[PDB]
């Protein structure tokens, strides 16, 4: 093999804090969590790893509340065990510069889109009319 290329989403590459949130629980409401998952989940400020390998992108979150991994192909769906427990069906895609991550369950849907914002990574969770932004930083 040889050494590949980069892509545009070497951007997300890293290591990520979470260091402020807006609205979180709100958006928890919206999606249906329930009570003291809500109140444990709004408590985290998790690492988030963002690596690429290939056409393969790997999020992991290391959380006080839950680890989740996830490794996928844009485009492409994919199965998730949600750190809230739920079964759902997802697909990302690159939209512009913003990843795009759409959740599928019970005939519900939300979006997550992460995007880079200065040194930042803002992510934005929408649950219809409900939006919660997360902000993260370098590690
Ligand atoms: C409730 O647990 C969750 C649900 C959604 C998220 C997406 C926003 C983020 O990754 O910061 C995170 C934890």
Same mark, same amino acid.
Request: net charge neutral; charged share 30%.
């Given at each position: 093999?040889?050494?590949?290329? !980069?892509?545009?989403?070497?951007?997300?590459? !890293?290591?990520?804090? =979470?260091? $402020?949130?807006?609205?979180?629980?709100?958006?928890?409401?919206?999606?249906?969590?329930?009570?003291?998952?809500? %109140?444990?989940?709004?408590?985290?400020?998790?690492?988030?790893?963002?690596?690429?390998?290939?056409?393969?992108? +790997?999020?992991?979150?290391? $959380? +006080?509340?839950?680890?989740? #991994?996830?490794?996928?192909? =844009? !485009?492409?769906?994919?199965?998730?065990? +949600?750190?809230?427990?739920?079964?759902? %069906? $997802?697909?990302? +895609? &690159?939209?512009?510069?913003? &990843?795009?991550?759409?959740?599928?369950?019970? !005939?519900?849907?939300?979006?997550?889109?992460?995007?880079?914002?200065?040194?930042? &990574?803002?992510? #934005?969770?929408?649950?219809?009319?409900?939006?919660?932004?997360?902000?993260?930083?370098?590690?």
């Amino acid at each position: 093999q040889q050494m590949g290329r !980069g892509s545009m989403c070497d951007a997300f590459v !890293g290591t990520w804090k =979470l260091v $402020s949130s807006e609205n979180f629980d709100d958006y928890m409401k919206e999606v249906g969590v329930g009570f003291a998952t809500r %109140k444990v989940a709004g408590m985290a400020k998790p690492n988030m790893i963002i690596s690429v390998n290939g056409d393969v992108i +790997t999020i992991k979150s290391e $959380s +006080t509340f839950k680890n989740t #991994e996830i490794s996928f192909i =844009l !485009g492409q769906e994919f199965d998730e065990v +949600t750190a809230d427990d739920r079964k759902v %069906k $997802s697909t990302i +895609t &690159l939209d512009g510069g913003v &990843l795009v991550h759409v959740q599928k369950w019970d !005939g519900k849907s939300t979006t997550i889109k992460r995007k880079r914002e200065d040194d930042k &990574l803002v992510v #934005e969770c929408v649950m219809k009319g409900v939006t919660s932004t997360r902000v993260y930083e370098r590690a």
